[PDB]
């Protein structure tokens, strides 16, 4: 009866789970989400979400490999189905799309789970949904450092625009400053990506966010924390030892916009990062960090806000003591 009735396959899955044959249930829930049956997409999200759980715990008799073999398959589809759902939700509410096409989309998407190729081309990339384009790259293990970075740049700019138009309009409540909305759109990916190195490369993305924080003036001028790019990545779970490893690379090369007296801000970032690092070690790094903080001091004298710099030098020399 499960073969032609969704609500009877429901009991068979309940039958197995009261008896603790968890794998056999996820085996049906997964095989049901992949079916040709008339099941809504949001139900298939429940099925795969239950299948992922029932296939996460050991069940008597069934191997560890076949248990993970099913959990991996179900988890993959759930990630895709979530993209497809979040995609359809946005396409339907998109004023740029004709009401005639929206019906043609909804019939195609609101059902079985399509390929990421179909989701990307005929929909996600056309609409310039840059955030959902990245989720597809992650869900597809898409190996390409450039296009991943190019998409991040477009996602940041389009986000900055939507927030600056809002601030200009204020629009029911006081909207957030641009970097705040940009910060939201990264957190949304960071939790959802689970911080894969391919689509979230701090080696390149952090300079981009720090560059955006300068080229678009998201700093003390508008009342923002000047070290908000560092605060963002640290709190997102990026290792302190890596953030300082990147700011080191930024302070030496001096590629624009990190040039001239703007490097005063680079040192402020380094002070915040390293300070949050020693405070995280003293709560619970080598010569190269001391080499940097001392080298960071040359920058402050080479730049010599006459009192800000002076106060900042004494924050750097304080960290050099804390490491040595």
């Amino acid at each position: 009866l499960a073969e032609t009735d969704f609500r009877h396959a429901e009991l068979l899955c309940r039958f197995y789970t009261t008896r603790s044959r968890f794998f056999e249930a996820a085996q049906v829930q997964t095989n049901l989400a992949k079916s040709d049956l008339n099941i809504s997409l949001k139900d298939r999200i429940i099925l795969l979400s239950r299948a992922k759980g029932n296939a996460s715990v050991n069940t008597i008799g069934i191997s560890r490999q076949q248990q993970q073999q099913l959990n991996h398959e179900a988890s993959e589809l759930l990630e895709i189905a979530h993209i497809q759902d979040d995609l359809l939700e946005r396409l339907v509410a998109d004023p740029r799309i004709p009401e005639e096409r929206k019906a043609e989309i909804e019939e195609f998407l609101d059902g079985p789970i399509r390929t990421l190729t179909d989701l990307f081309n005929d929909y996600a990339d056309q609409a310039n949904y840059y955030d959902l384009c990245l989720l597809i790259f992650h869900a597809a293990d898409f190996h390409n450092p450039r296009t991943i970075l190019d998409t991040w740049n477009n996602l940041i700019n389009q986000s900055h625009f939507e927030a600056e138009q809002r601030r200009e309009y204020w629009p029911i409540a006081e909207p957030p400053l641009p970097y705040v909305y940009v910060s939201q759109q990264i957190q949304l990916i960071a939790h959802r990506t689970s911080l894969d190195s391919l689509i979230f490369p701090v080696n390149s993305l952090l300079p981009v966010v720090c560059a955006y924080a300068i080229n678009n003036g998201q700093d003390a001028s508008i009342g923002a924390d000047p070290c908000w790019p560092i605060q963002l990545f640290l709190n997102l779970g990026v290792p302190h030892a890596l953030v300082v490893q990147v700011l080191e690379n930024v302070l030496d090369t001096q590629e624009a916009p990190f040039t001239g007296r703007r490097r005063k801000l680079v040192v402020q970032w380094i002070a915040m990062a390293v300070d949050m690092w020693v405070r995280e070690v003293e709560r619970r790094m080598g010569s190269w960090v001391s080499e940097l903080l001392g080298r960071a001091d040359q920058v402050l004298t080479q730049i010599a806000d006459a009192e800000e710099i002076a106060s900042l030098r004494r924050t750097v020399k304080g960290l050099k003591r804390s490491v040595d």
Binding site: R14, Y16, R19, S20, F22, G53, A55, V57, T59
Partner: protein, 305 residues
């Protein structure tokens, strides 16, 4: 104390020696070693007197920079294990009766961490917590308290057990940390008060107070009970402390067994719906013993129907 003794710069030299860059007719005394020998004799059972002699080393440091007096107090505490006497006992009421070292320096934050640091490195978490808590270092107190609680979350709290002896100290640290408005970073802190709630969830579950225990788990919004919350609850599990994800298996089963018992006693539809919710959540979550747990959860839901 009369600037007449010629101390030996290097601490690696013998007791008596002549510096290479000095005239041969004068000799030098390794004063640091001199006191270190005399002290070892009566440092074991007479700590108070030892400190009086260690003070003369206050003006000297070692190759690593530590203050010789402070280091000598660390080594003397690690060995003698005389915490209340030398460091000052911090009672469970919020008082800090000063110790013998308080006389010599008012900055007692480093050594209390030094002594707390080694005892932490020797798996003596229950002590490292008391010591870190003595220096009001909640970042470390709550960290260690998270480790000592997670293993004991689902266990049976029985008189004089390791659960009572740890729960009761954790609560004595929850009050003193709220009455004094102290807290570590939200990650460490959120997990610490979350475990305390779960410990209450199982203490009520093991007592048969099913209704009361069901209400607690509902507040925590940790396990979804209506299908709408599954998406958000599933995302939250990804960034919750592993000391919590570890005990997810026992939480789902207790919650299920709770609904399971209440069923045998419309309402039937509501329990049935919630039963389903737990399964789909567990299905989408990769966690400890997901195999045996996901199976048992499904069986208990079948008996309901």
């Amino acid at each position: 104390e009369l600037k007449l003794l010629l101390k030996s710069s290097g601490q690696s030299a013998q007791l008596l020696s002549h510096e290479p860059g000095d005239p041969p007719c004068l000799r030098r005394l390794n004063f640091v070693r001199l006191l270190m020998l005399y002290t070892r004799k009566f440092e074991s059972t007479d700590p108070r007197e030892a400190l009086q002699y260690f003070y003369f080393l206050r003006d000297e440091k070692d190759s690593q920079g530590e203050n010789m007096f402070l280091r000598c107090v660390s080594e003397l505490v690690i060995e003698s294990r005389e915490f209340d006497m030398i460091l000052g006992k911090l009672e469970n009421d919020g008082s800090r009766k000063p110790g013998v070292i308080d006389k010599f320096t008012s900055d007692t934050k480093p050594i209390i961490n030094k002594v707390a640091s080694v005892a932490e490195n020797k798996g003596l978490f229950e002590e490292a917590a008391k010591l870190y808590d003595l220096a009001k270092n909640a970042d470390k107190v709550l960290e260690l308290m998270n480790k000592l609680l997670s293993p004991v979350v689902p266990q049976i709290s029985a008189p004089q057990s390791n659960k009572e002896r740890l729960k009761n100290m954790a609560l004595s640290i929850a009050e003193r940390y709220r009455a004094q408005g102290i807290s570590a970073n939200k990650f460490v802190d959120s997990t610490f008060y979350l475990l305390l709630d779960l410990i209450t969830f199982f203490d009520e579950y093991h007592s048969g107070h099913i209704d009361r225990a069901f209400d607690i788990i509902e507040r925590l919004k940790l396990v979804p009970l209506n299908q709408e919350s599954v998406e958000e609850r599933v995302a939250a599990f990804r960034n919750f402390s592993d000391e919590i994800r570890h005990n997810l298996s026992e939480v789902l089963l207790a919650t299920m067994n709770i609904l399971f018992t209440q069923f045998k006693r419309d309402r039937d539809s509501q329990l049935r719906s919630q039963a389903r919710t737990l399964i789909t959540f567990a299905g989408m979550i990769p966690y400890r013993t997901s195999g045996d747990t996901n199976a048992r959860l499904v069986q208990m839901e079948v008996l309901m129907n």
